[PDB]
Structures are given as structure tokens and as C-alpha cells.
């Protein structure tokens, strides 16, 4: 009756760790893709920029 609760809390922690890794990966990849797109936008705007 006690080992059940212990195992439950245990598996909960494991699930937390897995979910944290997955969510962090997704967030990281989204941010990097956004940064790359911003970089290309800057590149085209520097091709269009005008002055000296």
C-alpha cells in the first residue's frame, strides 16, 4: 500500500523529466527558426538599403 504511492510519485517525476525535455526542444527549435527567418529578412533589407 505504501510502495504503490512511492512508485506513483516516482513515475510522475520521470514523466515530468521527459515532458520537460520534449517541450524545451520544441521551444528551442521554434526560436531558432524564427531567428533564421529574421536573419534572411535582414539580408534582403540590406540588399535594398540605400545611402552611403
Amino acid at each position: 500500500n505504501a510502495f504503490s504511492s512511492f512508485d506513483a510519485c516516482r513515475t510522475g517525476l520521470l514523466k515530468q523529466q521527459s515532458a520537460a525535455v520534449e517541450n524545451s526542444l520544441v521551444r528551442q527549435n521554434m526560436a531558432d527558426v524564427r531567428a533564421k527567418a529574421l536573419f534572411e529578412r535582414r539580408a534582403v533589407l540590406l540588399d535594398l538599403v540605400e545611402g552611403k
Binding site: 504511492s5 506513483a8 513515475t11 510522475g12 517525476l13 514523466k15
Partner: protein
């Protein structure tokens, strides 16, 4: 008369406060509880058992480990209902209109 309580005496002030016209139950101040971990713990345990979020939310229940209930609410039930009737009729007991019921309750609870 009421002198300053230094910072070192505050832990005793929290569980043995000075006298007021509206005191708490000092004997029950160590029994006041309200768990901020109740629902997180419940969810963690159920998700570890293997349930889904919907099942956990359906099985969730509010904490029973809270501050205990006043026994006066079960012992002085009729007196309290009568006092509340008097208050509702007489505008909150202005100019001493529910003194009868309040004094009966006070005597019943205190006994000199």
C-alpha cells in the same frame, strides 16, 4: 502599557498573541492549515498511477486537511439562526436589538 515587541519575540507572538476584543483560538492556531500542494500532488500521483488529465480532473477532490470547523456551528445552531433572524429584521442589531440572543449565546459558551 502596550510596549513594543522586538523582532526576536515574534515567533512567540504568532502563536501566543496579545489579548483583543476579537481573539482567535490560540489552542487551535497550530491546527490552521491550507495546502498549496494539494492539487499538484494529487495530479502527480494520479498521472504516475497512469491516468489521463481528464480522468485526474474528474477524480480530483478538494482538501479535507484544512482548518477545522467551529463546533459552535453545530452546538449553537438554533441560537445562531435566531440571532441572524433578529439581525436581518432589526438592521444588524442597531441600538441593542439582538442583545437577548447574543447574551444567551455568550452565557452558553462562557459559563462565567
Amino acid at each position: 502599557a502596550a510596549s513594543t515587541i522586538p523582532i526576536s519575540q515574534w515567533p512567540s507572538l504568532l502563536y501566543a498573541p496579545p489579548s483583543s476584543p476579537a481573539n482567535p483560538a490560540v489552542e487551535a492556531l497550530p491546527e490552521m492549515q491550507f495546502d498549496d500542494l494539494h492539487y499538484p500532488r494529487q495530479m502527480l500521483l494520479c498521472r504516475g498511477a497512469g491516468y489521463s488529465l481528464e480522468q485526474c480532473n474528474r477524480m480530483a477532490q478538494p482538501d479535507a486537511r484544512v482548518t477545522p470547523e467551529n463546533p459552535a456551528e453545530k452546538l449553537l445552531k438554533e441560537e445562531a439562526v435566531a440571532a441572524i433572524a433578529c439581525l436581518s429584521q432589526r438592521e444588524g442589531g442597531k441600538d441593542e436589538q439582538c442583545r437577548y440572543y447574543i447574551e444567551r449565546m455568550y452565557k452558553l459558551a462562557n459559563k462565567e
